[PDB]
Amino acid sequence: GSSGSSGMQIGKIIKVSGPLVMAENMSEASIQDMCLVGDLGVIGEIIEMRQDVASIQVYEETSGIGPGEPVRSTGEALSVELGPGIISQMFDGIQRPLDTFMEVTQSNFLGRGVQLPALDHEKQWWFEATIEEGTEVSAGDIIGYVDETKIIQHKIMVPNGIKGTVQKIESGSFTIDDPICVIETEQGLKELTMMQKWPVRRGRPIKQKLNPDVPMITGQRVIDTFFPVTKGGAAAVPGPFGAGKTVVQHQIAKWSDVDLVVYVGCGERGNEMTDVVNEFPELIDPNTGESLMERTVLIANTSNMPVAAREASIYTGITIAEYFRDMGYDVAIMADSTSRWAEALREMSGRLEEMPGDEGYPAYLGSRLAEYYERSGRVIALGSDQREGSITAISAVSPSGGDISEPVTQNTLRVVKVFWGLDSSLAQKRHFPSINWIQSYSLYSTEVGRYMDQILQQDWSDMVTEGMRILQEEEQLNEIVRLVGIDSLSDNDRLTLEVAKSIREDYLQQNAFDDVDTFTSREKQFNMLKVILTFGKEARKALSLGAYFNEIMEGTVAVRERISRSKYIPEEELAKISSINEEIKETIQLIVS
């Protein structure tokens, strides 16, 4: 000790270079440990250790900090608090509650060195004990639940590392700090609360991964039909600026059939986070009467917030997703944008004076991205229940100039099976969503095709294949029109263009801000595509029976206009869509006569 007494080890700052701080006398601290840096006590993480000198990645601004100031390690890795009080909250990158942040500091602006618990440790929750005393338990087992919202049960699980028999447990009103259960372990008696901590850089353990083979219903026609993602799948959304990336991801958040959405604003616009908190509570489910905000967790670290905290926000989010996955839920995790996460890594790599890899990004960029996406997936969770859960990852990428050959997009496409390439020329043409249907792909299409054929008892996969064949042929025909002019094409090729045109603007094009067009059910999608394809089929036969292309178009003005309105037909009047098929058959046969 010193001067007659002794306490804990106190590091001393010896260097400050932006978000990188070096501190000596840190021998008791471990790699990945969280520490409080400087007089202000800003949140930092130990990433390297040379003798007793720690290299620290700081998640707040370091302006105004210098050598000689103290550093205090917490002895624990970067972690999240996991318990009741987490749903419907807006956190920053390191899981600090932003509304509470504002109330405590009494400021509209972000200060530094503010220590806040992630959850409300004073709030009373009703714990409903569901397990019996004398029961042998291990990690993942449910001991009880909390109705955190009217729909979502917050299942209280035995934490990883705990194993034994339940000694005492009873229902009642507790905070997340009160002991609700006593476990008799081999290492003695351990008491559990409703909250557990978990290090964000370590994926939460599972029994085993499963094939993600059930398609997600986003209600977005271009996605569900041609480039579908499955529950437990991963999808990259790389696009240039101004291509509608935020509208697309918001559509998926509000309409997808998942139990919970984790939305991560990583290095992007503050107004888009403001849009979410304003809009999500207003989006009310007709069935349950719950808002989208009542099943959403928001993590925000905007472009002008601390750069290192961009990386933090990514791991904070996926770890919360894994937590709810472990309960047996289907979770969507939206990362917008993963490009800004990579930029953070590049900034720190420079401060550390590392050898740059592709485009100045560190050499471990690829493996970091791979490790992140491998944490998504459908799983059997731990617990005697052997319950199933999933995490579906939707990630925006922002490649400079829209050029997807850059490292972030390329390394992502190495490990994800779905690519929704956004297009600037489509966005200018008011074609929304701006997904390039020629460049995009989904490696789940074949498996989803089988699932759809089975659940619909229709030849859906053949219809999807035919629809894409037509679009691909359209691209070939459009090159010819560019060179010779459209008047040089045969009647058969003129028809293909019109059918492709119908697919493009009657099906692919979808208005997110139209009350009916904003969501299209699986059943409605089938009827719409069937009708579009039927017109082409009947018109094709008309041509082979001696009818001319011009005659077919002139005599089918009314029915083609009806096909183009089918997207606005209410979900309870889908008979109005299917009946178009007969009208097509009638009018065209009349034209032949």
Partner: protein, 452 residues
Amino acid sequence: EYRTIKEVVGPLMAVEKVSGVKYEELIEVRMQNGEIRRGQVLEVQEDKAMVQIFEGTSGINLKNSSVRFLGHPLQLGVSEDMIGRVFDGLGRPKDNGPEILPEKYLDINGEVINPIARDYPDEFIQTGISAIDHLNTLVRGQKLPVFSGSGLPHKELAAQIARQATVLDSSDDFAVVFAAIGITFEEAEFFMEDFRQTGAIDRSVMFMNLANDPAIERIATPRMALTAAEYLAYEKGMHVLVIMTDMTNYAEALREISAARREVPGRRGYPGYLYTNLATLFERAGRIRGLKGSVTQIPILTMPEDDKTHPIPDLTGYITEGQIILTRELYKSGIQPPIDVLPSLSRLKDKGTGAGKTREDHAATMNQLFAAYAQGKQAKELAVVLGESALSDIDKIYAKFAERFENEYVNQGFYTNRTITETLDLGWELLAMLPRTELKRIKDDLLDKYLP
């Protein structure tokens, strides 16, 4: 005060035997000849501080020079008396005006608005420019840039918006903050003379940074401007419009400073943190829940080689909420301003249009005018490649529409202010060219009421 300068290597200087020195702390070098230069701590290690001097290290004798550590980062002394005054890049008076007495001094980096405290951009700002107010509406709290090029009249457009911009039904609470970045003396003189001649100076604060000013001063300039804007907006309750040009000179200065520190260059040689750096400027725009006032930004930039994928317009577009595009094709046609509405966009325009803000027919006519103009331009290009006989009778009408749209609507002159009412009425005149049956984006209630 330390007399312990140890090393000078280029614009970089190492000072030893120091204590209590912080990252980004401002320093002051008293040269052996009494000359004073300011600097900034780039890095601090044990007893050493690495500093960069704004004006350079030429002529400095190490042993006979001293360094004072000021104990604060770069700051602006703010007051409401800044209105009508002209300052340089570092906030020093440039107009030979009276003494400026600051209410307080503010870190020019400002603070980050809590995302939960942030208020979505809302309400109309009338620029007086039809192509903007109607089709690409500027909203209070929005960042809406102008993408231009060398030889294009962005400086005339900047000065026009600066003097014409206003909020309706709200008197004596609007201000313009004008930041000139790395521009020549003569273009600075253009702006100064125009503001004074029109009287725009009386509601403006001006920060004028020149091409031959230190590169560090050039990058401090927009932060001085935005610090003044936030003070006027959030502390005085004003609606403040911030116009800054040329953002391309800003990025060049940033690259020059980056190279001096021998940092690893990113795409096209610009710093790897170019996006982040631009964001720390552009995200200062917005509104705050519970506060009167707003900061709105119009960054103006020249696209190198007219290339929109160049890092400067590209990263800007990833940050801003739309963009106003000037083109040479329209400039060569004498269209003033030469705004091309086809690639131009305002993302937040919905929050500043409609009844009570502009007029009830705003959105419908905008959708229709944009759609008709795109079809008109498409028909025009068809006549070019295949001839006039390749167009139908309707295609000919749309082609003629696109001509009058450019010649009469978009083209208004650089000294002509159109009220939103005049803009909307003029839009109905052009729409009347088309058959009523072709106005499919407008419902019958609006057609019956307004269509001339």
